[PDB]
Amino acid sequence: HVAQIYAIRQSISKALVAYYQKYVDEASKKEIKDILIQYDRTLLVADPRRCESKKFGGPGARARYQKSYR
Amino acid sequence: MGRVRTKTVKKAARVIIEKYYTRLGNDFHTNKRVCEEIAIIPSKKLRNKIAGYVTHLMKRIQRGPVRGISIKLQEEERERRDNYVPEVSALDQEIIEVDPDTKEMLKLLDFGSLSNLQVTQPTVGM
Amino acid sequence: TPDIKLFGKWSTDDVQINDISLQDYIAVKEKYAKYLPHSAGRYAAKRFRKAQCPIVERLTNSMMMHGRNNGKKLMTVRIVKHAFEIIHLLTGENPLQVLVNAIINSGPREDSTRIGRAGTVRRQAVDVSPLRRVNQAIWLLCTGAREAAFRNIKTIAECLADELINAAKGSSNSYAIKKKDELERVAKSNR
Amino acid sequence: TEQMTLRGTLKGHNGWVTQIATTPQFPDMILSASRDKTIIMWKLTRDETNYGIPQRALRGHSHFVSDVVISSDGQFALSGSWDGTLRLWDLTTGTTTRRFVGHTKDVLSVAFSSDNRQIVSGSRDKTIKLWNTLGVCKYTVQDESHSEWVSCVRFSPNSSNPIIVSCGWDKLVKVWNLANCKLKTNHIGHTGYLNTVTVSPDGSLCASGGKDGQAMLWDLNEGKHLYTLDGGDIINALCFSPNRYWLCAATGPSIKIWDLEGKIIVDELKQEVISTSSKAEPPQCTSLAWSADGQTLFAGYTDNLVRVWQVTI
Amino acid sequence: VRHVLLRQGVLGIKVKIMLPWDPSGKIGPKKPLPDHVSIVEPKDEILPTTPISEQK
RNA sequence: CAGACACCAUGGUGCACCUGACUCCUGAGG
RNA sequence: CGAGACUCUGGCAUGCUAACUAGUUACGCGACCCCCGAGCGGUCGGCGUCCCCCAACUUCUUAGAGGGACAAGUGGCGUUC
């Protein structure tokens, strides 16, 4: 649900800009890019973060099983 | 911090710089392609590190020769520049003050000159 | 909306920082106004990054603690929005101004760091960074609200509202204030 | 003799402006290739808070656009790019008509005829190719077509005769007669990899220069060597004036502008600046193109600004 | 690996051979060696001849 | 250099090992 | 020699070449047709099924070849290394 929210917001703003960039005019698209990029929310640049692989010997990815010691 | 250059990169870089000096630029992208032409490098990451260091070297090199590396043409240029003449040898320096024992060295070689005398405030230079 | 970016039913306007030493880790409009807090869900990416995060967003994040309540931001956002409303009825005002005042009053000045002195229990009086003062304040207040709610009728929203107002102008019924007075007193003493 | 004063400056590129091109019909157009994987079409409002405002962005490649060229009318754009393709766009809207695929390696240069139907390209896969506007490759001129990369291909005015002049990294210039693709003349005498070559606007002379920094003047009507004009520093781009015989060369530390009839140095325009480091201190000017009417001179710089000068006495 | 049966146990023979072909023959397994790079030679970018051209 | 400097003992065992003579022997031909 | 280098996976390619055991777009969109809204209504927009092309595409989906990261550009610092 959250993943999708963030994705949609990025696509709609990008959409508007994309349409104006090829068909309408540059000044409109550029104005939109200015307003967004400043406070920033990464709506014109991609997020790198995708799931990190799980490795054995733990119950989690970086979580590891309790050890026991005398 | 991490990913400091290894020996393999630097060796190749020295090689390339010396023998392809005129061909090489100062721009990563064009140099990367030149490294494909003038060598067989089996990985792109390796080729990029080589190319990369070679631009950095070219930038230093075009201020004259720099530490640990030299190009043959630049060596010739320095050689020619140094013809330097700092005396002509004696100036002439004839008939000037000399030490009282350096005086007897000239005297018994059929010359002599004017000479220093007297000792005041020894130790000398102190 | 682009003229001033408000909160989701309250204003970001008329929020004043009542201290000159706690500046630039208290913000809500000094660029950082949001209708809904959320940046990208990382805040540990750079050491720089903490400055970006305003006090409001930091307060929502710190709340979700203790295993069941971990990793539920949506629940916290609903609780927090409700909490702001509870503050507004109880004191009028702007709830964010109440929040800012609470942070300033709860933040310690001097604290103590460990120093060796014969192996006896002594410590060195030290001032702490304003970033630390804000971080610790937010911790104290969230932990206070949760602690009250646990075995009492009142919900986290209500207890959080009560905790902020008591700290905002002293009452000595706020956990954060009580803890701060202990830390500063001990600091003054020592070796 | 006249001189150049700075009329204004154009903004608004990311990465080096590798090429600039004007069209005859609109001296208020400037098409510019840049390192940002996009070519930007600008409408020049000739101005003094800017000097234009971008009209269109022609979107997208996987690697930098090295060279670009326009039609004689300036309604279509032909770009060559280092993603191993050339793309034909409608300049004033968008939409690729065609993608020209036939290179497996970087396309350094694209050029277009004045009849707008011969399109020639030079590439780092060591070919000169002759193409139609339909993406149909008419000729693939190999053999005696440089030993090495093809840095640039230029079109001589085609209504004299259709002749192209190519320059390559084997330190030679090859002149070709198209429609039979055989050498008119091989120009030998250069030192160092050739960055650029330019034709005169009536195709009478040719100026070729590279790493050596020596612009060599050749008679392109007989294939004979006139004389040499001395620079002393790498020439990135050469361009003759359309209404004068003035050659402008974008060198490493400075743009050196000269008058080739009579011979004198019109100006040396500096671009060097206090910022000592000193091995990363210079920009160099990588391109220069004269306007249609030759009043204005546009130069593309690696500081991401096209600087325009208008000639004043 | 080969197991050589002995009348007092088993002995393990392990033979490991590293091929003389990796950048040749023709070419051997997975590219040239990963830390080795081979150049050509230059022999270009010089002339003593003066600029002259002639029709072809 | 030129801030602070504390008690704390005890505990067992073996095999580490020693010589030189290049074939998968090719096995159509040889 | 080990590690680095290397390889494999994850992320950046509206560029490249493809797709009817994969989809998407895009009409013409009609029907099931609901009027939910606009339009008097035809018609337009609409979750899905159905109309399907000698449609178009590879964006999502797929996997092949390609490029992108080299501290590259720039500025400080350092034996200026």
From Swiss-Prot, chain A:
Superkingdom, natural source: Eukaryota
Subcellular localization(s) per the UniProt record: Cytoplasm; Nucleus, Nucleolus
Similarity remark: Belongs to the universal ribosomal protein uS9 family.
Function in brief: Component of the small ribosomal subunit. The ribosome is a large ribonucleoprotein complex responsible for the synthesis of proteins in the cell. Part of the small subunit (SSU) processome, first precursor of the small eukaryotic ribosomal subunit. During the assembly of the SSU processome in the nucleolus, many ribosome biogenesis factors, an RNA chaperone and ribosomal proteins associate with the nascent pre-rRNA and work in concert to generate RNA folding, modifications, rearrangements and cleavage as well as targeted degradation of pre-ribosomal RNA by the RNA exosome.
Assembly and binders: Component of the small ribosomal subunit. Part of the small subunit (SSU) processome, composed of more than 70 proteins and the RNA chaperone small nucleolar RNA (snoRNA) U3.
Protein name according to UniProt: Small ribosomal subunit protein uS9
Organism: Oryctolagus cuniculus
Gene: RPS16
Residue span relative to the full protein: 77 to 146 of 146
UniProtKB/Swiss-Prot annotation, chain B:
A GO term, aspect molecular function: structural constituent of ribosome
Main location: cytoplasm
UniProt-annotated location(s): Cytoplasm; Nucleus, Nucleolus
GO cellular component: cytosolic ribosome; nucleolus; ribonucleoprotein complex
GO biological process, one term: translation
Modified residues (Phosphoserine): 113
Cross-link Glycyl lysine isopeptide (Lys-Gly) (interchain with G-Cter in SUMO2): residue positions: 103
Keyword annotations of the record: Cytoplasm, Isopeptide bond, Nucleus, Phosphoprotein, Ribonucleoprotein, Ribosomal protein, Ubl conjugation
Post-translational modifications reported in the UniProt record: Ubiquitinated at Lys-103 by RNF14 and RNF25 in response to ribosome collisions (ribosome stalling).
Organism domain of life: Eukaryota
Keyword check for Ribosomal protein: yes
Modified residues (N6-succinyllysine): 19
InterPro entries named in the record: Ribosomal_eS17, Ribosomal_eS17_CS, Ribosomal_eS17_sf
Statement: the UniProt record of this protein carries the keyword Ribosomal protein: yes
Covalent cross-link Glycyl lysine isopeptide (Lys-Gly) (interchain with G-Cter in SUMO1), where: 103
Family per similarity comment: Belongs to the eukaryotic ribosomal protein eS17 family.
Subunit structure: Component of the small ribosomal subunit. Part of the small subunit (SSU) processome, composed of more than 70 proteins and the RNA chaperone small nucleolar RNA (snoRNA) U3.
Summary of the function given for this chain in its UniProt record: Component of the small ribosomal subunit. The ribosome is a large ribonucleoprotein complex responsible for the synthesis of proteins in the cell. Part of the small subunit (SSU) processome, first precursor of the small eukaryotic ribosomal subunit. During the assembly of the SSU processome in the nucleolus, many ribosome biogenesis factors, an RNA chaperone and ribosomal proteins associate with the nascent pre-rRNA and work in concert to generate RNA folding, modifications, rearrangements and cleavage as well as targeted degradation of pre-ribosomal RNA by the RNA exosome.
From Swiss-Prot, chain C:
GO BP field: translation
Protein localization: Cytoplasm; Nucleus, Nucleolus
Any GO MF annotation of the entry: structural constituent of ribosome
Modification sites for N6-acetyllysine: 34
One Pfam family, short name: Ribosomal_S7
Any one annotated GO CC term: cytosolic ribosome
Primary location: cytoplasm
Record PTM Phosphothreonine, positions in chain: 1
Transmembrane segments: none
Glycyl lysine isopeptide (Lys-Gly) (interchain with G-Cter in SUMO2) crosslink site(s): 34
Alphabetical UniProt keywords: Acetylation, Cytoplasm, Isopeptide bond, Nucleus, Phosphoprotein, Ribonucleoprotein, Ribosomal protein, Ubl conjugation
Entries under InterPro entries matching the protein: Ribosomal_uS7, Ribosomal_uS7_CS, Ribosomal_uS7_dom, Ribosomal_uS7_dom_sf, Ribosomal_uS7_euk/arc
Superkingdom of the organism of origin: Eukaryota
CDD domains, sorted: uS7_Eukaryote
Residue numbers of Phosphoserine PTMs: 129
Function: Component of the small ribosomal subunit. The ribosome is a large ribonucleoprotein complex responsible for the synthesis of proteins in the cell. Part of the small subunit (SSU) processome, first precursor of the small eukaryotic ribosomal subunit. During the assembly of the SSU processome in the nucleolus, many ribosome biogenesis factors, an RNA chaperone and ribosomal proteins associate with the nascent pre-rRNA and work in concert to generate RNA folding, modifications, rearrangements and cleavage as well as targeted degradation of pre-ribosomal RNA by the RNA exosome.
Assigned protein family: Belongs to the universal ribosomal protein uS7 family.
Subunit relationships: Component of the small ribosomal subunit. Part of the small subunit (SSU) processome, composed of more than 70 proteins and the RNA chaperone small nucleolar RNA (snoRNA) U3.
NCBIfam families reported in the protein's UniProt record: PRK04027.1, uS7_euk_arch
Protein name, UniProt field: Small ribosomal subunit protein uS7
Curated annotation (Swiss-Prot), chain D:
Positions carrying Phosphoserine: 275, 277-278
UniProt keyword Thylakoid, yes or no: no
Residues recorded with modification Phosphotyrosine: 51, 227
BP GO annotations: apoptotic process; gastrulation; rhythmic process
Modified residues (N6-acetyllysine): 129, 182
Membrane topology (UniProt): Peripheral membrane protein
PTM characteristics: Phosphorylated on Tyr-227 and/or Tyr-245 by SRC. This is required for binding to SRC.
Keyword annotations: Acetylation, Apoptosis, Biological rhythms, Cell cycle, Cell membrane, Cell projection, Cytoplasm, Developmental protein, Gastrulation, Growth regulation, Host-virus interaction, Membrane, Nucleus, Phosphoprotein, Repeat, Ribonucleoprotein, Ribosomal protein, Translation regulation, WD repeat
WD repeat placement: 12-43, 60-90, 102-132, 145-177, 189-219, 230-259, 280-310
Subcellular location: Cell membrane; Cytoplasm; Cytoplasm, Perinuclear region; Nucleus
Main subcellular location of this protein, as a coarse class: membrane
GO annotations of cellular component type: dendrite; nucleus; perikaryon; perinuclear region of cytoplasm; phagocytic cup; ribonucleoprotein complex; ribosome
One Pfam family named in its UniProt record: WD40
Domain notes: The 7 WD repeats mediate protein-protein interactions with binding partners.
Name assigned to this protein: Small ribosomal subunit protein RACK1
